[PDB]
Amino acid sequence: ERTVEMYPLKSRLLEVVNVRRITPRMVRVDLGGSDIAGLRSDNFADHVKLWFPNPETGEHVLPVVEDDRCLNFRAPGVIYRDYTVRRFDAKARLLTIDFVVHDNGPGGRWAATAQPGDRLGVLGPRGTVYYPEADHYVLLADETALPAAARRIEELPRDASVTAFFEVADAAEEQELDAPEGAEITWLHRNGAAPGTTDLLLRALEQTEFPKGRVFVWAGGEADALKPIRRLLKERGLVRGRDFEVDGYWRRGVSNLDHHA
Numbered sequence: 001e002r003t004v005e006m007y008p009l010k011s012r013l014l015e016v017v018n019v020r021r022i023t024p025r026m027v028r029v030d031l032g033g034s035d036i037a038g039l040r041s042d043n044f045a046d047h048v049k050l051w052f053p054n055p056e057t058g059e060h061v062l063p064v065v066e067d068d069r070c071l072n073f074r075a076p077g078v079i080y081r082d083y084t085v086r087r088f089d090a091k092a093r094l095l096t097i098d099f100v101v102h103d104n105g106p107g108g109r110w111a112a113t114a115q116p117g118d119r120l121g122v123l124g125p126r127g128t129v130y131y132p133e134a135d136h137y138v139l140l141a142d143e144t145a146l147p148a149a150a151r152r153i154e155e156l157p158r159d160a161s162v163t164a165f166f167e168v169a170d171a172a173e174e175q176e177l178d179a180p181e182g183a184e185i186t187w188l189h190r191n192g193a194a195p196g197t198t199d200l201l202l203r204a205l206e207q208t209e210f211p212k213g214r215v216f217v218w219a220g221g222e223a224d225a226l227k228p229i230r231r232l233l234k235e236r237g238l239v240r241g242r243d244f245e246v247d248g249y250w251r252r253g254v255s256n257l258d259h260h261a
């Protein structure tokens, strides 16, 4: 059964140790430091809030945590954003985060200049969500949700079937993934269209025959793009949490979208 487990909250200050520019618009960052003690991540969509410096003020507000709650979400000067735990290696003591590099916000702009020695406040994960096994996983993701989708794919048993549709800017943004045998992974290219302005994921889903066996559909990406995907799944009688999950990670014209509500 679908199960939530909470983690204890603590304010961590971590430092960039490795930077890997894996594709032109994505940078993979390993964060470390003694604060990483006690950090946990059990599932593919686990995410932290990263707390960034202000590039203009030089100000850098970090999380304040007291009695298992963050106290300063509404303090002035804070810049926090949700990012996926791409990988967590407890023995290496390193937290890996994949950042989309874009110019529209401070998280994207920080990623563009990320280098060893940069530090970030790291809050969470608040907890983790376990799912029962499925026979066939259908995954849809634009670049903000690709880290979680890729983590999922690489953690699947070799027996699993996968059908994945990943929307990226162009062919140079494709990644080589360690997927189960026979996985079907399709890279969809915006080819000049701006992020969040196409219906490429919906169109791919519409062309996909519902597979055999126990199926789970997971979609993440731009909130408005996901609305017709949610509707399509529900109209075929599928139930949120059991048959699918659809999670808006960002939304055009909105800064720091809260995906909880």
Ligand SMILES: Cc1cc2nc3c(=O)[nH]c(=O)nc-3n(C[C@H](O)[C@H](O)[C@H](O)COP(=O)(O)OP(=O)(O)OC[C@H]3O[C@@H](n4cnc5c(N)ncnc54)[C@H](O)[C@@H]3O)c2cc1C
Pocket (backbone or CB within 6 Å): 047, 081, 082, 083, 084, 085, 098, 099, 100, 101, 102, 104, 105, 106, 107, 108, 109, 143, 144, 145, 147, 148, 195, 248, 249, 250, 251, 252, 253, 254, 255, 256, 257, 259
């Ligand atoms: C659970 C969760 C997990 C996430 N994991 C990741 C992750 O692993 N990697 C990752 O890159 N993102 C991830 N995101 C998305 C990320 O939180 C947003 O993209 C966030 O808005 C980026 O912060 P920002 O400061 O760059 O710009 P913001 O200040 O939040 O937004 C400024 C403007 O830029 C736009 N914008 C925001 N993101 C993008 C984008 N990627 N491309 C184009 N325009 C954008 C906004 O619509 C807004 O107009 C995740 C979201 C959630 C909810």
Ligand SMILES: [Zn+2]
Pocket (backbone or CB within 6 Å): 047, 259, 260
């Ligand atoms: Zn969350």
